[PDB]
Amino acid sequence: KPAVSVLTMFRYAGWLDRLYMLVGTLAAIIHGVALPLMMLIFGDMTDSFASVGQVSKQSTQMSEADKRAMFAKLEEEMTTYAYYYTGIGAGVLIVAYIQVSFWCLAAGRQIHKIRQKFFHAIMNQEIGWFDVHDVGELNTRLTDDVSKINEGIGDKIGMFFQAMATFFGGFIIGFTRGWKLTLVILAISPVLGLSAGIWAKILSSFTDKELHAYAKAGAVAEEVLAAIRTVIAFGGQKKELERYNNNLEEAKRLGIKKAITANISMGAAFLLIYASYALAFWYGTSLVISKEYSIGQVLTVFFSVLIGAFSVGQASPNIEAFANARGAAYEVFKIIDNKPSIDSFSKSGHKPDNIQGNLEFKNIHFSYPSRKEVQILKGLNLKVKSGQTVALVGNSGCGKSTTVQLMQRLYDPLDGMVSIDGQDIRTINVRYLREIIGVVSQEPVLFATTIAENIRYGREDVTMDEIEKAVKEANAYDFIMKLPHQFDTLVGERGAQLSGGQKQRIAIARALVRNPKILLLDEATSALDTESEAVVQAALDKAREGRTTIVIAHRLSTVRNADVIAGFDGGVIVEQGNHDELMREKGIYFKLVMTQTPPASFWRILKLNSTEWPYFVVGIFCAIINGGLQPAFSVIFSKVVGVFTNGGPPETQRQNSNLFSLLFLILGIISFITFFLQGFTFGKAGEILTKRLRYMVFKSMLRQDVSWFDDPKNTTGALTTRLANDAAQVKGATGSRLAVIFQNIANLGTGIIISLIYGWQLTLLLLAIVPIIAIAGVVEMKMLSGQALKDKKELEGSGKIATEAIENFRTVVSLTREQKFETMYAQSLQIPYRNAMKKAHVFGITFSFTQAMMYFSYAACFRFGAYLVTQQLMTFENVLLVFSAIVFGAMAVGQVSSFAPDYAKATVSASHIIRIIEKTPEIDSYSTQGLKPNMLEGNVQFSGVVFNYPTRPSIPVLQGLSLEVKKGQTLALVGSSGCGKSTVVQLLERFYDPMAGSVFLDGKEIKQLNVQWLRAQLGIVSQEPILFDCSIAENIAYGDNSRVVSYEEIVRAAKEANIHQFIDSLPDKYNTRVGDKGTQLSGGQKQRIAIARALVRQPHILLLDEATSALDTESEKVVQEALDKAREGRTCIVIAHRLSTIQNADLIVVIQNGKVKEHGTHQQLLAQKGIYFSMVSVQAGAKRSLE
């Protein structure tokens, strides 16, 4: 929203830039004025043929006499006009090039400076400024906003002024050639602007509505695909598919409605355009018959004014372009204009020599820019003698690090002063200060380049000798020399990830090259392995002894040798002294011491919509008729001016112009019928297959097994997105575009037949010209994208070094060498800059070439139309017809190139949607095959089962697992940890078939059993049961599908689950809605409902998976009571984590590494002393302990 003064935005343009912009906008205005002058001459041409057209037909006596004066008039006149046109061509060529080239040049030249200055400004900021701002947003802000600014100051301005020039020029010529027709053409303008408004208002409203419909279905789809395992378990797939299908059923209806309305609107708009357009022309004729206007003048003012009219609409977008650019330039310049307190790019202040390194902190109060919320340092006093080494210690708050933070003058203290030697730290130059101080940080960072270069970030001027001595003095020489490439080895986030201690040593070496008088070590030893810690500690100790040092860490192994140790409490310095003294003090220090001791292009996609043989032929026939209707608009306009030019005796004219002007409209109204049709037939055809596809996609998505849903590649969101997009995309390829293409080929076809049969070689000529300028138009767009992509690749590299610089910034400021990144960034930018120079050279040529070719083409038009054709008996009225017809065939063909990417995108999107359908699972719930045993009583046999999850075939969950459980008895399953306990329940549901081994129930192998029937006999209850949005009775009735559950039945089930307390209490009772849309319930109720749907099914096998997992207090008690009442009448497998509730179980089984380890009744496992005994003792010790 905030803007920028127009002058400040251009502040980086001076001398040649302003010149370029001036000559540019000049040439632009010229280019603009050029076109309406073209239409001015066009009226003078009509007058020439009109003068001869009347006289030629006025004779009806002498013939040869008309071969003399007429041909001479046409000779001189046509030659003059052709000469002029040729004149215009060179002009538009030159001015076009000048315009685009100059403006693009200016843009590039400026944006270069913008980028450099901006990055500099980013680097120049103090750390306090970073602390409050998101770096990602800032970097993206750089890359994107500078691009917006680029788009703003670019050639768009030239286009804008050019359009304004066509506007003024058009209306100037319009007015001067006459006032009436212009005012009459202005009279219609409000009517057109309103019709375009009705066009707009409908889109914004309905586009939202269209998104809303799929959001209601998408909700079903999402909750389902989120609940996939549950719906799989209970086998309610047909129901979910049904619901989704119903939602689609609604969606398509809303769709066809929108189609009808939209098509009606478009048709009406087209009708208004036709009507006004014809009307103005009729009035024109009415003015020509009065001899008030010449027949050509009418054309001139008409076209000039309409040109001038559209120029506005064509101009407007370039306003928004420049508008956005100011808004973007605001936040950009804000940082560049911002001058900090600290600078560090400044050369100022003292640079002391022979620093002894006597440091003192005096009464320092400070807070980070969280400001008044917390004040970490309340007062302070500290000294450290020259050559000494002080160690800071503290319990928490990290006020320790604050001193190291302040000693680099990253922040100025609120009150108090940090004094290096005798002088205040603020009097001495920042850079020099940072250079005389070395720093080693807990987390070291290595910029990505050779080791030498990272060591070279200590000092720009250095030799491999100093690097060697530096790393050797840090004892890092061995480890890196053993590494390949020697000093030239790579480091960074990408590639050659090394040990922390090694990176730290490299950091210490880097710091050691700095040869600092002052050394600051903050928890550099901390957060590192104990073995390498000593290795790095050796270096750290060797890094001292030439320097004064302030060290901070959690390691009290390194503190003892310190000359002074300093404790802090609540930001207040308390204890100071040698170790023995502090241990004699028995204070905080002593305390802490004691504490720490794939394309698819097919008509196969069409074979699916081949479901409808009709609805297509209708649209195509209709659209071809429309395609045959399109050139008819030309044939009239030809003969309207044609007969009027060919009129001869005037008496018969005024009667004919009324017959055409009528007909002129008649093709209009019939255009309403055909346009609405081909839009409606294609629309309705679009919404139906969208139901068929999504219904076929969703269905087959419920076919797939859990193996496919566990895939990280497929998630609910990704599936719903893949579900929406492809179906949304295929509609576009089979939709309006195709109809338009057929309409346009039909258009050009009928047009070219008429043109070709009328004009002999007049048309054959154009057909040589036109396909060339069209192809010349497409190739231009190809070079535009090529230069665009290549440019993106080059700045991607410069933006990469920028991200590296500003993400690690707090480090680079400590090492200084920001100027390094300045220079690197510049050198990185240098290549895109020279590239942007060539861009202007190219953009101008391709533009001017395509403009000149169209003006030169317009010269060859009338030149061949006149002369050779008109010297023959061939006539002007036909020429005027052929140009219209052909050039419109072309402008219609343009829509073929414009509509190209839709099919491609739809192809890529139609690729996935067939594959997703054709994919088949290992276990398909749809198969009607399988035994369906007649015997009720369940057993379960697990024998030598081996299982690895398809997602993670590394660590096996089950190896040779063997279980057995008889009917009507509970099988308790205990385990150390893992899904092994659950994998039993998962395998019995047959979500997976095990790698090796086998599992039986009635003695039949479930693998050969019917999947649905198998799953139909199971009582599964999970940890956190998901309930879909619908009546709780429908959530309970979900337990049994293929049949509607009785009320008294879900009542009985609700009674068995002890949830009846809630259900009878609610106002809506069993009709109440749950699932967070209409109501909220706690875990207890939800679980009891899960139990209800579990036992409404009347399973012979109950499966309780950690049912009490998330729960508390009495809820566990009542839910366990329910679960306990639920079993004992059925086969059961209970993996619950409360072993106090397993104490009554028919069989307990301890799982170990996939093998059953211990098994037996409680008292037997208790009689034994082993895993189960420990499992029970450890958690049994808790309940006794809670007292």
């Binding site: 357009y277 309409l306 306009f637 050039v887």
Partner: peptide, 6 residues
């Protein structure tokens, strides 16, 4: 050429 046919 505008949008009818010339």
């Amino acid at each position: 050429x505008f949008x009818f046919x010339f």
